[PDB]
Amino acid sequence: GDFVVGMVTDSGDIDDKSFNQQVWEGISRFAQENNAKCKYVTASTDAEYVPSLSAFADENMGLVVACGSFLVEAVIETSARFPKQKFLVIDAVVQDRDNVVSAVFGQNEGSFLVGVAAALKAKEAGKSAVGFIVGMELGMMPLFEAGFEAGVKAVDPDIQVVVEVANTFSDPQKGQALAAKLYDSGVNVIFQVAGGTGNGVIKEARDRRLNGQDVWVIGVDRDQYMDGVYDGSKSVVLTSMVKRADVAAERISKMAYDGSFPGGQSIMFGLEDKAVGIPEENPNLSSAVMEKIRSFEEKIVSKEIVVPVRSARMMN
Ligand SMILES: Nc1nc2c(ncn2[C@@H]2O[C@H](CO)[C@@H](O)[C@H]2O)c(=O)[nH]1
């Protein structure tokens, strides 16, 4: 009765206020705007990856959407078994499948911009270290730290980045504990790239500011500014590294619907396409800081500056 987009997620959370929420929102906008339909299924564990993708393929859906490094092996295999079913993979890369489109993000480029913001706010307080909490380091995840570090160093090479890995995108309790550890060490800015776990980092930041500690957090995926309001007016969210996974999902769903699915291609959503970067409006960033950020942004887009894909501590 309808063209249907089916999302298989490795997370039991489309309300994660970040990544899975953006993807579902994009699929949902596509369906609403095109008189189509959509649904999703959660595949918490590995053993459910193959059967989950297979069931949607057996329903002859218009498009099957899968995200992350946990689902890619299952997509690689399943796409070969169902050559006539279209699949979209987000945050991972598939080769040799003309029925699969891979959407990847230049998140190192966007993270460079928030690194500049972090370094400037840290210097403002005489701090020589900033924090970074990442959900997991598999797949393309290392791009965030690589760009964040590069942006921090572009402002001041002596500022150190202190990294904590949660090893989960669905544990806010862990997010708060890791944020507490960083703030307790004297850091005043933390960039969180941790999906649902990240909501706990934002909570810890709100709790600290509420009681007079001058701390900040930089959000991810969505413009998380309102998520950090702690006293009725002010927010602890310095800025956010926005990643338009919603636009990628919406646009490719439309191409599938229209017969122009770019099967077999990897599509890069970057700073020049405005698919990553910072929000258009940033109450906590001054005009001076914004001009500095915009300046670096232009040098990255033109390639005058190329942002690394791996941080210094991860390079030989
Ligand atoms: N595989 C996977 N990646 C996620 C999830 N949540 C967040 N991420 C990744 O972590 C980044 C920051 O939230 C997102 O842009 C994604 O790259 C999740 O539930 N599963």
Swiss-Prot record:
Gene3D superfamilies in UniProt: 3.40.50.2300
GO annotations of cellular component type: plasma membrane
Residues that hold guanosine according to the record: 10, 20, 91, 169, 195, 221, 243
Main location: membrane
Localisation: Cell membrane
Topological type in the membrane: Lipid-anchor
Keyword flag Membrane: yes
Annotated residues for binding of adenosine: 10-11, 19, 91, 169, 195, 221, 243
Pfam family membership, one: Bmp
Positions of inosine binding: 10, 20, 91, 195, 221, 243
Domain of life: Bacteria
Cited PROSITE patterns: PROKAR_LIPOPROTEIN (PS51257)
InterPro entries: BMP_lipoprotein, Peripla_BP_I, PnrA-like
Protein keywords: Cell membrane, Lipoprotein, Membrane, Palmitate, Signal, Transport
Induction details: Encoded in an operon with TP_0320, TP_0321, TP_0322 and TP_0323 that may code for an ABC-type nucleoside uptake system, with TP_0322 and/or TP_0323 encoding putative permeases, and TP_0319 encoding a ligand-binding protein.
The family this protein is said to belong to: Belongs to the BMP lipoprotein family.
Subunit note: Monomer.
Function (record text): Binds purine nucleosides and may play a role in purine nucleoside uptake. May be part of an ABC-type nucleoside uptake system. Has highest affinity for guanosine, followed by inosine and adenosine. Has very low affinity for cytidine and does not bind thymidine.
Protein name: Membrane lipoprotein TmpC
